[PDB]
Amino acid sequence: ETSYTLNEVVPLKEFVPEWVRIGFSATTGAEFAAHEVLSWYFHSELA
Amino acid sequence: ETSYTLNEVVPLKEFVPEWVRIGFSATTGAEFAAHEVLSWYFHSELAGTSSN
Amino acid sequence: TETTSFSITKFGPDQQNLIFQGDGYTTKERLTLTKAVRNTVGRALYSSPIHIWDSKTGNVANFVTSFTFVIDAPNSYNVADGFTFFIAPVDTKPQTGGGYLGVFNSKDYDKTSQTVAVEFDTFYNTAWDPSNGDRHIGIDVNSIKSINTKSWALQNGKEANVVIAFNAATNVLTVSLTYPN
Amino acid sequence: TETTSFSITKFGPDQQNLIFQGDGYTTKERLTLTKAVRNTVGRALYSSPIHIWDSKTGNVANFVTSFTFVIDAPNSYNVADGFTFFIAPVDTKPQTGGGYLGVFNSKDYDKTSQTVAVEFDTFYNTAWDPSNGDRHIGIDVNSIKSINTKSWKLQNGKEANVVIAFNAATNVLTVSLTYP
Ligand SMILES: CC(=O)N[C@@H]1[C@@H](O)[C@H](O[C@@H]2O[C@H](CO[C@H]3O[C@H](CO)[C@@H](O)[C@H](O)[C@@H]3O[C@@H]3O[C@H](CO)[C@@H](O[C@@H]4O[C@H](CO)[C@H](O)[C@H](O)[C@H]4O)[C@H](O)[C@H]3NC(C)=O)[C@@H](O)[C@H](O[C@H]3O[C@H](CO)[C@@H](O)[C@H](O)[C@@H]3O[C@@H]3O[C@H](CO)[C@@H](O[C@@H]4O[C@H](CO)[C@H](O)[C@H](O)[C@H]4O)[C@H](O)[C@H]3NC(C)=O)[C@@H]2O)[C@@H](CO)O[C@H]1O
Ligand SMILES: [Ca+2]
Ligand SMILES: [Ca+2]
Numbered sequence A: 001e002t003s004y005t006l007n008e009v010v011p012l013k014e015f016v017p018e019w020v021r022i023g024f025s026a027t028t029g030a031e032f033a034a035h036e037v038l039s040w041y042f043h044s045e046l047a
Numbered sequence B: 001e002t003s004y005t006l007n008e009v010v011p012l013k014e015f016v017p018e019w020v021r022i023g024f025s026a027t028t029g030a031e032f033a034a035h036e037v038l039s040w041y042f043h044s045e046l047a048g049t050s051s052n
Numbered sequence C: 001t002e003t004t005s006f007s008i009t010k011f012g013p014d015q016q017n018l019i020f021q022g023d024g025y026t027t028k029e030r031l032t033l034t035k036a037v038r039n040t041v042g043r044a045l046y047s048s049p050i051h052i053w054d055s056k057t058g059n060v061a062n063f064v065t066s067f068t069f070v071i072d073a074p075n076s077y078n079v080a081d082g083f084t085f086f087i088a089p090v091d092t093k094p095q096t097g098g099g100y101l102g103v104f105n106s107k108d109y110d111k112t113s114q115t116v117a118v119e120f121d122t123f124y125n126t127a128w129d130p131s132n133g134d135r136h137i138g139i140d141v142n143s144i145k146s147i148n149t150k151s152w153a154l155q156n157g158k159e160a161n162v163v164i165a166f167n168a169a170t171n172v173l174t175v176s177l178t179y180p181n
Numbered sequence D: 001t002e003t004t005s006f007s008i009t010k011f012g013p014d015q016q017n018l019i020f021q022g023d024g025y026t027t028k029e030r031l032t033l034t035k036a037v038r039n040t041v042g043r044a045l046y047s048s049p050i051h052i053w054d055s056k057t058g059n060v061a062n063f064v065t066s067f068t069f070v071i072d073a074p075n076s077y078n079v080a081d082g083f084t085f086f087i088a089p090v091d092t093k094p095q096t097g098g099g100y101l102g103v104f105n106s107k108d109y110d111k112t113s114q115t116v117a118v119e120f121d122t123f124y125n126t127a128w129d130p131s132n133g134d135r136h137i138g139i140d141v142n143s144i145k146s147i148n149t150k151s152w153k154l155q156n157g158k159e160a161n162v163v164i165a166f167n168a169a170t171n172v173l174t175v176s177l178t179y180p
């Protein structure tokens, strides 16, 4: 049922190097929870 | 337009590990030539559910 | 043209095409980044570098990614810190934990960071999170203080499917979280 | 399911998703494996490992690769040694050069190499090559002496397009080389 969306103009080229690595991070501090990923799909194309 | 095709049954899981790296090699020795690649496309798909 | 694609539907014990950092490991068909233990970091990165823009040409990449994750906390109030999909330099190693979500080290813009991350933040860090104190989705560019955020109700233990897309023609980055209930 | 794909239509000078070995590098949008120079070896490997089979289910993967390549000999006679597309363990390193194509070290079957290669051999080596002396495409599993060969006439300086496909259901490896 429930969905959430966010959109922003983020000129990526101005912030990140031409080659990058992508992935996931998760942390806990004084409080905690397990963070687990079940599947992942990615596709990119540079003309 | 001239083509050559070759087919062979080769049972891969007998010859390669589960995880591999793919690539090109080219050598020259006493005799030689430039060996280049101009483009490459790859796609693999493992069921790990069905078979295909 | 250059294209990079991959999909891992069930992660498995020797998932050699992922780089695991901190406490990330794969277990029981899942990528487990953190266990419900206090104060740890876990990260996982796709093995190949991907070309996101080209200097010669000015061309930036279009991309799309989707993944389903589970945050499993002890109860709905003691949950922290969150989860992130980030894009960083090729040699990125874990940064500050806790509320910095292992990707950043500060609330002020730091051009050296070179990290854009979409976060699913479950803990209100008064020094930089929105004044409503809600759990939230956000886009972080080079700082843990998000340039935009949307409030989100965490459903503890439920799977959430996320799509993140970047349209290079408009530079709009879009993220959708949907709980299948 | 696990899939892995990429395409590189033109190789840039900083091609970070490939691992380069020996003399390989990218120059003027091409990947250069050897130059028209004596005794070198060049290899380029895609950076991710590829889950080609799974010992838990026993499933094997289907795959297609296609590439355009060029051999550019001094002239059509004095040409050696050839080019290879290979699948090897994740830690693969260059093996013996010359007629071993930087990928095998023996004419004899070695199960520890764990490489299968599709070669496009432009030099005849008496000890393991088709006695007819022809240049040829071969399918090599763990030795440089192919389990199957096909003669092929080299058109020097011409772009060849090859498709290599593997069908897990029949375990058939297909290779097609076509000159336009
Ligand atoms: C106001 C004040 O100053 N209070 C002091 C605290 O400064 C002091 O330590 C900090 O505690 C923070 C939270 O304090 C809570 O308690 C006080 C009063 O008891 C409350 O006033 C305060 O509001 C906090 O309540 C906690 O609040 C949070 C929200 O802020 C609640 O979560 C939700 O909140 C929303 C909105 O309020 C809503 O109500 C939800 O329903 C609710 O659940 C939470 O329920 C409530 N309970 C607790 C137990 O706080 C901590 O946030 C602060 O930071 C650590 O933890 C957070 C969360 O995981 C991280 O985001 C943060 O970055 C940081 O992470 C790492 O934590 C570890 C462990 O503490 C740190 O490691 C230790 O660090 C030491 C030096 O700092 C040494 O290195 C040591 O070896 C090492 O083990 C690590 O450094 C942190 N990393 C980083 C980068 O920061 C921090 O702990 C507390 C201590 O009791 O006392 C208060 O009075
Ligand atoms: Ca927080
Ligand atoms: Ca030969």
Ligand SMILES: [Mn+2]
Binding pocket: C119, C121, C128, C129, C130, C138, C144, C146
């Ligand atoms: Mn936040």
Ligand SMILES: [Mn+2]
Binding pocket: D119, D121, D128, D129, D130, D138, D144, D145, D146
């Ligand atoms: Mn041969």
